[PDB]
Design a protein around this ligand. Structure first.
Ligand code: MG
Length: 263
């Protein structure tokens, strides 16, 4: 906490973010000195496309519930770790290359986490484990080559998961086993050659899946599970136009539909 009144711009050294705070507080200048009681009044921050390089100071905003920081130049989110009241965190289009272990462990009220269009290469084991109220996780347009074993296991409330436009080489065995509420799963535009046997079997609520634009390896017998699953659930598979398209999972090399192959 801030113990003595202090200029907005000292607490929030990034010029653009200090201006966000000033406007939210209805203060007249970023040189105005502010109190912790004033900072306690902030219930959300909506600062998309604002050239923000740093959110240093945000740690003094304990009551922030909705945080939208899309389209800035953020490379560190250390300062968010204490924002225990956060329910929506939108970090689209920043320059995060990693998530330090633990960064989200106190964010237990989070319902939606949007990490689209960052440069995340990998995730630490258990990074999402405390996000037990999470319903929407969006990791699309990152650089992920793998997922940790068990990374979604604690996210039993998850209803949408978007992994599209990464470079996933494989999925861990069992990775979706706890996701019994998941309705919408996007895996399109990755580098998947295969999925684990049974990988969709616990997805009792699944209504929509995207599998297109992966270089599926249709060699037998490896492809049997996927081919069988698509045929059994053909109405669930969608293309990029959003239409029902079970043939949109294609064999790399032959180009024919995965679901046409009988081992
Ligand atoms: Mg929802």
């Amino acid at each position: 906490t801030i113990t003595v009144s202090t200029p907005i711009k000292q607490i929030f050294p990034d010029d653009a973010f200090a201006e966000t705070i000033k406007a939210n507080l209805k203060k007249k200048s970023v040189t105005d000195a502010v109190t912790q009681n004033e900072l306690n009044s902030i219930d959300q921050i909506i600062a998309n496309n604002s050239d923000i390089k740093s959110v240093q100071g945000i740690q003094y905003l304990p009551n922030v519930r909705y945080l939208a920081l899309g389209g800035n130049k953020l490379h560190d989110i250390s300062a968010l770790k204490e924002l225990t009241n956060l329910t929506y965190l939108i970090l689209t289009g920043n320059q995060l290359q990693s998530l330090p272990n633990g960064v989200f462990d106190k964010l237990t009220n989070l319902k939606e986490l949007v990490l689209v269009e960052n440069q995340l290469q990998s995730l630490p084991d258990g990074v999402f484990d405390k996000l037990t109220n999470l319903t929407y996780l969006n990791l699309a347009h990152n650089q992920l080559q793998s997922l940790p074993k068990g990374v979604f296991d604690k996210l039993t409330n998850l209803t949408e998961l978007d992994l599209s436009y990464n470079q996933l080489q494989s999925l861990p065995e069992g990775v979706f086993d706890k996701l019994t509420q998941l309705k919408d799963l996007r895996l399109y535009q990755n580098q998947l050659k295969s999925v684990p046997d049974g990988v969709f079997d616990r997805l009792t609520s699944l209504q929509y899946i995207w599998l297109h634009d992966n270089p599926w390896d249709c060699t037998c017998p490896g492809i049997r599970y996927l081919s069988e699953w698509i045929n059994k659930h053909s109405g669930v598979v969608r293309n990029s136009a959003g239409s029902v398209a079970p043939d949109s999972a294609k064999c790399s090399g032959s180009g024919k539909p995965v679901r046409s192959i009988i081992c």
